[PDB]
Amino acid sequence: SDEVRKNLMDMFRDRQAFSEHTWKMLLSVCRSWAAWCKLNNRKWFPAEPEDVRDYLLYLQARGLAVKTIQQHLGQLNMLHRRSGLPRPSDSNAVSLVMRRIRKENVDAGERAKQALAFERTDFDQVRSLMENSDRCQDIRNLAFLGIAYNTLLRIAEIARIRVKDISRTDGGRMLIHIGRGVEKALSLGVTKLVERWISVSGVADDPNNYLFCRVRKNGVAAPSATSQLSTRALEGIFEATHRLIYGAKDDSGQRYLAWSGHSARVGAARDMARAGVSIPEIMQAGGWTNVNIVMNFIRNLDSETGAMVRLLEDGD
Amino acid sequence: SDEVRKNLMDMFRDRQAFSEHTWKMLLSVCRSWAAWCKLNNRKWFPAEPEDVRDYLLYLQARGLAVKTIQQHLGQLNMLHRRSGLPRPSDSNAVSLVMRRIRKENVDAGERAKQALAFERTDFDQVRSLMENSDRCQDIRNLAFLGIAYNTLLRIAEIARIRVKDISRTDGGRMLIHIGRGVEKALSLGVTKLVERWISVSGVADDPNNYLFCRVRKNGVAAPSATSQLSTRALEGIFEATHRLIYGAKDDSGQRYLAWSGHSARVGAARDMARAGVSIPEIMQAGGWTNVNIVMNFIRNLDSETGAMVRLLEDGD
Amino acid sequence: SDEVRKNLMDMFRDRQAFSEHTWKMLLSVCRSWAAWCKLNNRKWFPAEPEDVRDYLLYLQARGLAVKTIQQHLGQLNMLHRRSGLPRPSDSNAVSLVMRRIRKENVDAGERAKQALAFERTDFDQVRSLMENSDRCQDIRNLAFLGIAYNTLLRIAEIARIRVKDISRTDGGRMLIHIGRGVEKALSLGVTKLVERWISVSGVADDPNNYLFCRVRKNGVAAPSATSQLSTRALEGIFEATHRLIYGAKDDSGQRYLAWSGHSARVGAARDMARAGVSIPEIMQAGGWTNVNIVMNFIRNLDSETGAMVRLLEDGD
DNA sequence: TATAACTTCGTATAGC
DNA sequence: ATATGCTATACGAAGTTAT
DNA sequence: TATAACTTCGTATAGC
DNA sequence: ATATGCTATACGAAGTTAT
DNA sequence: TATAACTTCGTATAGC
DNA sequence: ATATGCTATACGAAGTTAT
Fold it and tell me: Where are the domains of chain A?
């Protein structure tokens, strides 16, 4: 909606105050809230608590996730916080509602989902199928999956690696520099996969080139120092790779039926936990600084570690 | 008190809103609060802050633990929260009090107790005395202690295991399914102890039978699919076993003089921590999802792990 | 300022209510706040929110750290909390300010500093230079550094160890008792360094003597059971030792250019994390009970542990 | 051209 | 067991190019 | 019957 | 270092059965 | 005496 | 990702002793 858009074209005096992704959500939420206000004849701004309360129930009644509802409330609070007005959340009507909503949804067995894990068994299998391939796409995709699994980097970080970010370390292994500002080390095998992609694509012809680039139907790579592969394409590589082994996905429309952008990070974190790796080393592997946050991420450890069986059988 | 009882027979429109144990405490607290109100001539409901404040001080002045006092305040807040009335806790008189109370009690050196640990040395010792026994009670009790230590399950969970929950895994070891929904793996030795109990008691004659059942003075087991051993009896097994090795307990009336229902969970958690097991694997062993919660549980690690001595002596 | 001093000579009915260090800070803050109030003509007590707000901005505008600003606000809240007056912090003007202040400072890239690490490589190097020394000062200093690194004890705890606190454990290693109430174990090598210091200084002539004592320019030790080395002298040993290997420090006036009192605790914690030691064992090594607190301490792990490279190369 | 292989986009929701 | 704030990924679909 | 071996119960308090 | 909400275990004692 | 080697002190800031 | 409360260390400098 322009009234919201045309206007949201206008305001918030200092752009760099919020992330672009953040601005996008504020706008989507504002469109939603505005449309609901229009249909139900309520005042859009400043919002009235009883109205916000009813709007949140409306989201819940349409099947939205608690995190989604928290998001809409979040933006509303923002919009408002910026023009110095009591945030909808500080109205006790909105507070009781978010509480009720959380409780029901939970008692409804609802819980935050998580990407389908791409683990070491998955990596070895894909490597089995793909390693001998002479297809440019396969060479690129396999290097991408190796990095994703080895480094646990998010797709947006991987899309932004430039050739100059790569250096060598112990044994010839590659080291990838990630700016705000760490260095990610690759194994000999993954370094080898990346070296192949680099050699075939010619990305190293200009050190400012992004490590990964498009590969057209012709099989011709298009190195570039100004254009990154979208995070959407990187998610597509995970999806394609899944299709390759398992065929097309069930038409349920449910999320996570195939690997996605977060799959290798989810998978590698579970593998480290399953292997008895300590928390600090797991934290370093994925760049976490909060233990609570890392443990929530690995809440779906998916194999039995049998620490008590091992102790009782004394190792064995 | 019936006024509280006879009435607490009446209300709270949807039972399944609170756990039965929860209802029990609400009632005990209500009886306490009502009696105090009666003796001191105060209004029981709705409660007045200054009165709640004085009632909490009364609990403290009678030697109750902070967790106990928090409990009584907790129920009072509830009773009240349900009929939409400011919770006693939101009165600043009650807030300052709980704060003062916590500080003094603490400065008084008071700290949350913990069950006497039943550890691997304890398990091996009991196994030494009991393993050759031909007494039905000993066969049952030793299997119970093996499961408790190996699985870290709470007594209420152990009381509810049915024979059909048991399956086999790698090596013939048993796997015990625990519904809301995990699988607990037993060592070869504990599986063997459980197999013996199963074989002698005949519980496996009906898969719906609870794994553990009563054993009368005659030595005749009474398998059942409708009646569980009480958690009280399971605590009694820990107590009896302690008496067996250490004689009767000192008459101080202090808690935790003998092993209790939580002993093997406390003990096994300390053993895993002492053996250098990682946190995620310790969490999986006992079913924890919050790191803070697992670490508070293992706050009494009771042997020196000497990580710095090992590093300095380089392992050794 | 006496008005603040001469008066802060007077009040707070029960000294042992706050730590002496705490009283010192309250006084320094009160002097600061009073001087600012004087210069700017504002009322010192009870403080007005708008005034506190401006005073905090004044601290920020003079380049102070967020933790420093929180400190001044902290004492102000105290002074006030004690005479039952709304704490400056409960004024929304002070709340918004602390929030704004935290955000800017952060966005300014400001982050809590940490002592320069004294790690195992540092300990081995210093031991290389110093171990053959016949200088009383070197013998004492090397034992001090060994204890600091091995035990992770704070300088105030080390200053207070008395000879009677020392006992022997497995292998002749020393055990040091630390009262509120743990036992710190020393390696064979560090025990040996401590034994030498003990033998040369004669501190063991009276078991009540503090383990570490002054060593005058003459090289004559002064054992004592009533006087401890100051924590300032212990920090000086770290500084001197750093100078010994690296020369004098850059005149930038920046903190942490040389080792300080917390260096060996920072260093040993990083070494344990880097060696794959589990969190509970790291917690026991340094006396931590909160996982969050231990992880924040080790937020600067300074070598690559390569958990994913190891897994991929399968250990190797 | 058809099309592979992307890119952009908006709502939904996980993770730091 | 836990609440809120900001920024990321998820993914169907519609738009874009160089075949 | 006496009694072992439970079960139920209420207040107290640990743990998720 | 930390507060509150809900549900568990702790345990003496009194009630129950099948000896 | 000069001085090493401390101690005390006040403001600044990390860590429990 | 996070706020507040209390107690520690950081360190330049000025004061103290026994050389």
Answer: 1-111, 113-306
